[PDB]
């Protein structure tokens, strides 16, 4: 090749005029070797053609070209960047196609108005009116940057081509035009939004292909924001109402998905007239996907009803459908509802929440699907901040205390997870007065798995409340078990000390737990004695070296003399891991 | 070797059999250990007593979730580790492996199924063939079973065996006199200890099993008084509630295979004897 440019080429592999990747990124520098003139005359030309799909390379080339205006001569010459960009737009792997368009959109603003017409638009058309399809699925993304700046006359052409792109024979060129109809709409004067955009919108909304229709819902949000409220009923709502009624559940799904957005774009009045009933239909769609999407929007929707008619529509139009959903068959739906249903408390007030929501709050807190009761448990903050901690405690607690004690240990195990959540949510003062007891009681449960769960649970509670809280609210009651006549409980004591050293710090572990551990080295049962060796091994690293030498080493050494085989074994292992051997 | 045992146990806990080679080793040492033990093996509390497990491996894992893990919790199994269940190999091998690794944390008694004839009628033999490729693993295990203690006495008060009482055995000394190192005979004291069932008819009755005998409350009372026993703890019989008291509480049956044969819909139980011999029962459904 030729050396100023040949540095880009990769002479070592066995490709087809391929380039050095970690060199295309070092592109803005070869552009300085040859200067502006030579960058335009030989670097860009060389990059235009010579395009071997090394993809990761094609990508960097398209990105880099978007920040090359100045390396080419500044504004007056930005159009020299089009040729290779037009190229990369029509590639295949879409990632590259996108970077090409993003860049094309970036340098569009560098083009002067006069240069947009002479070079940019012509590129939009060639892409729009291109043969291949990709050349069209990317054209759609370039109309809104050049429309505002060109002549009234070229704007017209730009309108026609975008239209032609909407009624393109290929669906993809239609889906793409649909997903960009919104932004193009925001840059046309109003008259043309009413006379040209609306028809394209109507057309796309009634597309044979539903993959095109469900996209029109998004476009509707955009067009509806641009139109004065009075024009909405005639030019838009019929179409939107039809979409919520669409044969394809996908189109309907998109309506529930973009509901809150439609609500704002449309206005309080139409939301009261048209959207409230639609929302009700959607919450009763036969497809569980659609019901679930709608349910998910319940709080957001009610929040945006005009404060004026708000409370009366919720109590009359929304709430009944909600009572229904709480009992829906699909857990997909109950799932979506529970992750927001209590968010309606600050919108109905203490009294309303207490009489109408709390009952649904319980219906789900005792539901099949664990995700459902978990979604309710994960969002107590809002209801708690509306009704009192006592009004809540009085309606939640009995549910909990009723599950902490139960049939299968499996269900009891489930209630233990709610703990760190309840703690971090309802507060530490509430946890110490109503929950602490329950967490202590499980340590001494009949089923080992429960004890175990309750034990690791202590670590997670300390992470919530801190080492000080632990030294005054949990360590004492946990150490009390060291004197239990049953070895299962005595061992539980060490198991709690093991987990709590992971988070109580050197101080609290050395002063307040280590002694109890060292003290049990003389337990009458061997299982406690060897778990004592295992415990020192575990909490050992947390202790400073002085303590390990004067207080642990001696105990382990004694235990290695023990009558029992296993205490000996574990004592030796302890000494070896800690290096006191 | 210890690092090894630990690995085998980690493997078996995933329900993955050991190899023929390893089984042959597990068993040669297991015998070394079991030969030293007595026909009336001395066990001190605390201990958790379990009944039949019959190769229901996943229910055994459920048992450990309820009673704690070995060697932290001390265990006493009253036999019947194989047959009926779908995993006789993984189950008996894990237990024999826990014994070799922890002689003092686990006691394994012999049940009516830890024998050569019955395992060829109810599973063990065939499962072994279908999992190794010849009868060797089964010869290794059935030879080991000859060494399993027929009985355990906890704190000199609670007497544990698989089946029940024999008309030709009145004292713990009578049992200690038997030669247990041999296959289970079709008749006699040793057979009876592994086959008999407590009954609600007095005296000795004809067993519906075809081996051993049924014995009533009066016989339990006499045997308990004569031997300074507070209780006879056995298994061998399916008990819907997992465990069952009888003979005015001189006898308790503990069955640890929930939903036996995956057909009976019984609960399982395990019995905890604390540091003081105070007892308590844990009932459980099959693992999900
Ligand atoms: C095993 C047994 C006995 O225990 C069993 O006792 C009886 C009374 C109680 C018992 C049933 C208990 C039920 C809860 C289970 C539940 C289910 C779902 C199935 C089933 O399962 C039983 C076998 C087993 C293993 O599952 C068990 O539960 O016992 C067989 C009957 C099945 O309905 O009943 O049935 C009468 C039939 C009898 O049948 C065989 C018996 O013939 C075996 C025979 C006496 C033995 O003779 C020898 C030689 C002489 C000395 C002894 O050794 C060689 C080995 C073997 C041939
Ligand atoms: Mn039996
Ligand atoms: Mn049995």
Strand partners, B269: B283
Confirm whether residue B162 is marked as ligand binding.
yes
- Spatial separation of the C-alpha atoms in residues B5 and B22, rounded to whole Å: 10
- Nearest CA to A87 out of A44, A144, A23, A117 is that of A44
Dig out the tokens for B31 from the structure.
């015998």
- Nearest CA to A247 out of A290, A280, A276 is that of A290
Give the B-side interface with A, CB within 8 Å: 2, 46, 64-69, 71-74, 102-105, 272, 274-276, 280, 282, 285, 288
Instruction: Output the domain CATH number for residue A102.
Output: 1.25.10.10
CB atoms within 10 A of CB A116: 25
| Cα B236 to averaged position of ligand 2 atoms, centre (Å) | 4
> Which H or E run includes B41?
strand B41-43
- Spatial separation of the C-alpha atoms in residues A88 and A99, rounded to whole Å: 8
Dig out the tokens for A104 from the structure.
């094309």
> Which H or E run includes A107?
helix A94-108
Whether residue A448 and residue B68 make contact (CB cut-off 8 A), yes or no, is yes
Structural domain containing residue A218: 1-581
- Nearest CA to A408 out of A366, A444, A450, A452 is that of A450
Gyration radius (Cα) of chain B, Å: 17
* Packing angle of the helix pair A389-404, A409-426 (nearest 10 deg): 160
- Spatial separation of the C-alpha atoms in residues A43 and A485, rounded to whole Å: 87
Give nearest CA residue, ligand 1 atom 13. Answer: B238
How far from B125 is each of B89, B92, B133, B182, CA to CA, in Å?
A: 10, 13, 11, 19
Checking DSSP bridges between strand B241-246 and strand B251-254, what pairing results, if any? antiparallel
Whether residue A527 and residue B71 make contact (CB cut-off 8 A), yes or no, is yes
Whether residue B280 and residue A446 make contact (CB cut-off 8 A), yes or no, is yes
Mark whether B113 is an active-site residue.
yes
Q: In degrees to the nearest 10, what's the CA dihedral of B7, B12, B16, B19?
A: 60
Cβ atoms of residues A82 and A68 within 8 Å: no
- Nearest CA to B279 out of B43, B44, B49, B42 is that of B49
Dig out the tokens for B211 from the structure.
């081996």
C-alpha count within 13 angstroms, C-beta hemisphere, residue A58: 23
C-alpha count within 13 angstroms, C-beta hemisphere, residue A530: 21
C-alpha count within 13 angstroms, C-beta hemisphere, residue B141: 34
- Spatial separation of the C-alpha atoms in residues A478 and B116, rounded to whole Å: 51
> Which SS3 state, helix, strand or coil, does residue B163 take?
coil
Q: Which of B51, B84, B118 to mutate to test the pocket of ligand 1 (most atoms within 8 A of CB)?
A: B118
DSSP string, B75-122: EEE-S--SSSSTTHHHHHHHHHHHHHH-TTTEEE---TTSSTTGGGTS
Cβ atoms of residues A293 and A257 within 8 Å: yes
Query: Exposed (0-12), middle (13-18) or buried (19+): which is A334, by Cβ within 10 Å?
Result: buried
> Which SS3 state, helix, strand or coil, does residue B245 take?
strand
Which atom of ligand 1 approaches the CA of B260 most closely?
18
Cβ atoms of residues B258 and B267 within 8 Å: yes
In sequence order, the 6+-apart residues with CB closer than 8 A to the CB of A255 are A217, A240, A243, A244, A246, A262, A278, A282
- Spatial separation of the C-alpha atoms in residues B125 and B118, rounded to whole Å: 9
> Which SS3 state, helix, strand or coil, does residue A165 take?
helix
Task: Tell me how far apart the 2 most distant CA atoms of chain A are, in Å.
Answer: 102
- Nearest CA to A68 out of A121, A120, A18, A32 is that of A32
Q: What is the DSSP letter of A285?
A: -
Q: What is the DSSP letter of B287?
A: P
Beta strands in A255-390 (DSSP E): none
The answer to whether residue A448 neighbours chain B at the CB level (below 8 Å) is yes
- Spatial separation of the C-alpha atoms in residues A266 and A222, rounded to whole Å: 10
- Spatial separation of the C-alpha atoms in residues A285 and A255, rounded to whole Å: 12
In sequence order, the 6+-apart residues with CB closer than 8 A to the CB of A336 are A292, A293, A295, A296
Estimate to the nearest angstrom the gap between the alpha carbon of A538 and the chain centroid: 37
A with B: how many residue pairs have Cβ under 8 Å apart? 52
| Cα A407 to averaged position of ligand 2 atoms, centre (Å) | 29
The answer to whether residue A469 neighbours chain B at the CB level (below 8 Å) is no
Whether residue A527 and residue B65 make contact (CB cut-off 8 A), yes or no, is no
- Spatial separation of the C-alpha atoms in residues A300 and A526, rounded to whole Å: 61
C-alpha count within 13 angstroms, C-beta hemisphere, residue A68: 34
Q: What is the DSSP letter of B184?
A: P
- Spatial separation of the C-alpha atoms in residues A490 and A522, rounded to whole Å: 12
In sequence order, the 6+-apart residues with CB closer than 8 A to the CB of A205 are A213, A216, A220, A239, A242, A243
- Nearest CA to A229 out of A272, A270, A181 is that of A270
- Spatial separation of the C-alpha atoms in residues A251 and A274, rounded to whole Å: 17
Token pair 């005792």 is found at A366
Query: What's the start-to-end Cα distance of chain B, in Å?
Result: 35
DSSP string, A24-47: HTTHHHHHHHS-HHHIIIIIHHHH
Strand partners, A180: none
Checking DSSP bridges between strand B231-234 and strand B251-254, what pairing results, if any? parallel
Whether residue B74 and residue A527 make contact (CB cut-off 8 A), yes or no, is yes
Model resolution, angstroms:
2.6
Dig out the tokens for A198 from the structure.
């609306």
- Spatial separation of the C-alpha atoms in residues A111 and A106, rounded to whole Å: 10
Region class of A525: left (phi > 0), else alpha (psi between -120 and 50), else beta? beta
- Spatial separation of the C-alpha atoms in residues A277 and A316, rounded to whole Å: 12
Dig out the tokens for B159 from the structure.
């007497």
Residue B243 phi/psi, 5-degree rounding, is -145, 155
Strand partners, B267: B241
CB atoms within 10 A of CB A32: 10
How many domains, chain A?
A: 1
Confirm whether residue B58 is marked as ligand binding.
no
> Which SS3 state, helix, strand or coil, does residue A1 take?
coil
Which residues sit with Cβ closer than 5 angstroms to ligand 2, an ion?
Answer: B 80, 112, 236
Cβ atoms of residues A264 and A229 within 8 Å: no
What is B1-288's CATH number? 3.60.21.10
Angle in degrees, CA A27, A30, A34, rounded to 5: 145
Which residues sit with Cβ closer than 5 angstroms to ligand 3, an ion?
Answer: B 52, 80
- Nearest CA to A407 out of B150, B86, B267 is that of B267
Confirm whether residue B266 is marked as ligand binding.
no
> Which SS3 state, helix, strand or coil, does residue B253 take?
strand
DSSP string, A221-275: HHHHHHS-HHHHHHHTHHHHHHHTT-SSHHHHHHHHHTHHHHHHHH-HHHIIIII
- Spatial separation of the C-alpha atoms in residues A428 and A435, rounded to whole Å: 10
Estimate to the nearest angstrom the gap between the alpha carbon of A306 and the chain centroid: 29
Tell me which chain B residues have a C-beta less than 8 angstroms from the C-beta of A448.
64-69, 73
């Amino acid at each position: 090749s030729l050396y100023p440019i040949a540095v880009l080429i990769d002479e070592l592999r066995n490709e087809d005029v391929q380039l050095r990747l970690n060199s295309i990124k070092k592109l803005s520098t070869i552009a300085l070797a040859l200067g502006v003139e030579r960058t335009r005359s030989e670097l860009l030309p060389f990059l235009t053609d010579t395009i071997y799909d090394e993809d990761e390379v094609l990508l960097a080339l398209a990105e880099q070209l978007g920040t090359f205006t100045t390396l080419v001569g500044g504004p007056e010459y930005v159009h020299c960047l089009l040729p290779p960009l037009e190229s990369l737009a029509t590639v295949e792997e879409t990632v590259v196609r996108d970077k090409a368009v993003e860049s094309l959109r970036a340098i569009s603003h560098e083009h002067s108005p006069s240069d947009l017409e002479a070079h940019f638009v012509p590129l939009v058309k060639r892409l729009a009116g291109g043969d291949w399809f990709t050349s069209r699925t990317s054209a759609c993304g370039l109309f809104s940057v050049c429309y505002p700046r060109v002549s009234s006359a070229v704007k017209a052409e730009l309108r026609q081509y975008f239209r032609n792109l909407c009624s393109d024979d290929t669906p993809m060129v239609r889906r793409a035009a649909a997903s960009k109809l919104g932004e193009f709409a925001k840059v046309l004067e109003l008259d043309n939004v009413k006379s040209e955009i609306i028809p394209m919108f109507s057309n796309l909304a009634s597309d044979e292909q539903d993959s095109v229709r469900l996209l029109a819902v998004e476009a509707c949000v955009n067009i509806a924001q641009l139109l004065p409220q009075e024009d909405l009923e005639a030019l838009v709502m019929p179409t939107l109402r039809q979409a919520a009624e669409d044969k394809s559940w996908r189109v309907r799904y998109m309506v529930a998905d973009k509901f809150t957005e439609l609500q704002k774009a449309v206005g309080p009045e139409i939301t009261k007239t048209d959207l409230v009933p639609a929302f009700q239909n959607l919450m009763k769609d036969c497809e569980a996907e659609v019901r679930a999407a709608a349910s998910h929007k319940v709080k957001e929707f009610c929040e945006n009803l005009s404060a004026d008619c708000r409370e009366n529509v919720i109590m009359s139009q929304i709430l009944p459908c909600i009572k229904e959903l709480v009992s829906d068959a699909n857990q997909h739906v109950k799932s979506a509802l529970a992750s927001v249903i209590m968010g309606l408390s600050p919108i109905l007030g203490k009294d309303n929440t207490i009489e109408h929501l709390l009952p649904l709050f319980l219906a789900q807190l005792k539901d099949e699907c664990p995700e459902v009761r978990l979604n309710i448990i994960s969002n107590l903050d809002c209801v708690n901040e509306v009704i009192g901690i006592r009004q809540l405690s009085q309606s939640l607690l009995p549910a909990i205390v009723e599950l902490a004690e139960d049939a299968k240990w499996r269900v009891r195990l489930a209630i233990i997870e709610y703990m760190p959540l309840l703690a971090g949510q309802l507060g530490v003062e509430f946890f110490d007065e109503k929950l602490n007891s329950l967490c202590m009681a499980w340590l001494v449960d009949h089923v080992y798995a429960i004890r175990e769960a309750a034990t690791s649970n202590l670590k997670k509670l300390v992470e919530k409340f801190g080492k000080e809280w632990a030294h005054a609210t949990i360590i004492p009651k946990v150490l009390a078990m060291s004197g239990d006549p049953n070895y299962l409980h005595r061992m539980t004591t060490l198991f709690c000390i093991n987990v709590l050293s992971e988070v109580c710090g050197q101080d609290i572990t050395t002063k307040h737990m280590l002694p109890t551990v060292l003290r049990m080295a003389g337990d009458p049962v061997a299982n406690v004695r060897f778990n004592v060796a295992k415990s020192l091994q575990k909490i050992g690293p947390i202790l400073d070296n002085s303590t390990l030498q004067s207080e642990v080493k001696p105990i382990l050494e004694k235990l290695t003399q023990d009558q029992d085989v296993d205490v000996k074994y574990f004592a030796q292992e302890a000494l070896t891991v800690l290096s006191l051997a | 070797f210890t690092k090894e045992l630990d690995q085998w146990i980690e493997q078996l806990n995933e329900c993955k059999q050991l190899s023929e080679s390893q089984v042959k080793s597990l068993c040669e040492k297991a015998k070394e250990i079991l030969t030293k033990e007595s026909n009336v093996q001395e066990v001190r509390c605390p201990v958790t007593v379990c009944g039949d497990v019959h190769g229901q491996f996943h229910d055994l894992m459920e048992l450990f979730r309820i009673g704690g893990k070995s060697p932290d919790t001390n265990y006493l199994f009253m036999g019947d580790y194989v047959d009926r269940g779908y995993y006789s190999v993984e189950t008996v091998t894990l237990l024999v492996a826990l014994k070799v690794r922890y002689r003092e944390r686990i006691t394994i008694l012999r049940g009516n199924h830890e024998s050569r004839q019955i395992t060829q009628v109810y599973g063990f033999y065939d499962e072994c063939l279908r999992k190794y490729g010849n009868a060797n693993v089964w010869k290794y295990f059935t030879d080991l079973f000859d060494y399993l203690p027929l009985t355990a006495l906890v704190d000199g008060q609670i007497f544990c065996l698989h089946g029940g009482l024999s008309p030709s055995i009145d004292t713990l000394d009578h049992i200690r006199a038997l030669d247990r190192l041999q296959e289970v005979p079709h008749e006699g004291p040793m057979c009876d200890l592994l086959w008999s069932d407590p009954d609600d008819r007095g005296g000795w009755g004809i067993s519906p099993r075809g081996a051993g005998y049924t014995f009533g409350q009066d016989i339990s009372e006499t045997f308990n008084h004569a031997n300074g026993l507070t209780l006879v703890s056995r298994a061998h019989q399916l008990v819907m509630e997992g465990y069952n008291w009888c003979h005015d509480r001189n006898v308790v049956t503990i069955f640890s295979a929930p939903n036996y044969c995956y057909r009976c819909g019984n609960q399982a139980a395990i019995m905890e004897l604390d540091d003081t011999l105070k007892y308590s029962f844990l009932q459980f459904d099959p693992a999900p």
